[PDB]
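To assess whether the prediction recovers the assembly geometry, we first specified each molecular entity separately, as shown.
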Amino acid sequence: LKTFSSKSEYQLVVNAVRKLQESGFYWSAVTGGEANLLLSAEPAGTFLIRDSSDQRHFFTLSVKTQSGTKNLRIQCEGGSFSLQSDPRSTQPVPRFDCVLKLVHHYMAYYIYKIPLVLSRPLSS
Amino acid sequence: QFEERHLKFLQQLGKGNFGSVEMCRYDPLQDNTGEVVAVKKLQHSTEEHLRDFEREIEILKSLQHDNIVKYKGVCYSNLRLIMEYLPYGSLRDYLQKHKERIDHKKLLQYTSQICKGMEYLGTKRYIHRDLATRNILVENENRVKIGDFGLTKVLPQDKEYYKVKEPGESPIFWYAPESLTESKFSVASDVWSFGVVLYELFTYIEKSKSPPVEFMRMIGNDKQGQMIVFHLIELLKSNGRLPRPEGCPDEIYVIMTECWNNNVSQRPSFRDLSLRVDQIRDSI
Amino acid sequence: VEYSTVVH
Ligand SMILES: CC(C)(C)c1nc2c3ccc(F)cc3c3c(=O)[nH]ccc3c2[nH]1
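The predicted structure of the complete assembly is given in tokenized form:
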């Protein structure tokens, strides 16, 4: 398991999860399993935020697309949430102070090579 | 001194951290009558390991105590470390082997040894952090030694805490709340860790009275990922701790919960600890 | 689990 880097980084998650629980589409401690399931009866472009299963990441974005349900790791490094970077990514990954602000940004961006479709959240 | 060409591989003991520990026998005569010693080597030799592995040796070299594992020597192959051979192995596995053959006064005796070892460790300004029953060794039925100073760091001249801003995989259940939030390890982070070690002893870690299994039981066996560390902090900040070990004296569990105090100041020193241990030892 | 990365 990875412990927090600094006091700032901890207080960051407190506010990240607070604003996440208030958001309504935050599904706590849900694995990648229900993600491929709950987003099956949802249109392509429906998404949710869940707790990552990996010890390296706090949260993870799951989104239903045409190819199927795809999941996205959300790294927190130095107090900024960003999506995981691709080697073929020419443009740098956007950083954000709030985890919610990361979502709104993505609502062109592609995913290995279908586009990134963020439309509707999944209420909890 | 030592030459690896004489070291005859007998068996493998165990593996911990970034190295492998093997039972070998150094005999310069090659007539196979030499003394048996334990040997720890690196599986994959990298700069981030070989350097840190050598720091562990330089720490152990400076550690000379009855309750601190005795440093033997060194030899290169890729570095390789030579130490004394303790037959009964780790305190973790030994406590599971002979549950019945070990009573209360014995568990207090080890605790007194671990404390006195932590005092000799603390006076030289070292922070073990990895204080756990899997890192404590057993020489004989009545004597234990502290081993594997891999995670041991040296305290600064001014600062009383050693902070690692770039953490890897860690025993977060043996970690103090301060070690979970700012990743700052003090001597009190060892008092907390010792608190969990003290917990492990009076349970013998039987079945599912393990610090992970117990903490997971409290935060729910569903919370996964890095988000586990967060919920654990919430649990420790909300003054929730590992339950009483089955059939544990009252004065002993009090000590556990007092080492598990959130405030750094309120955590009793290893001086104060060793005093109560011997106080309850001769009383019983 | 089915994980992917975002290309810009
Ligand atoms: C796993 C860890 C690296 C902590 C470790 N395990 C052992 C160990 C296990 C069984 C056994 F019979 C002996 C040992 C042993 C030993 O005999 N000397 C020094 C370290 C050490 C050790 N160090």
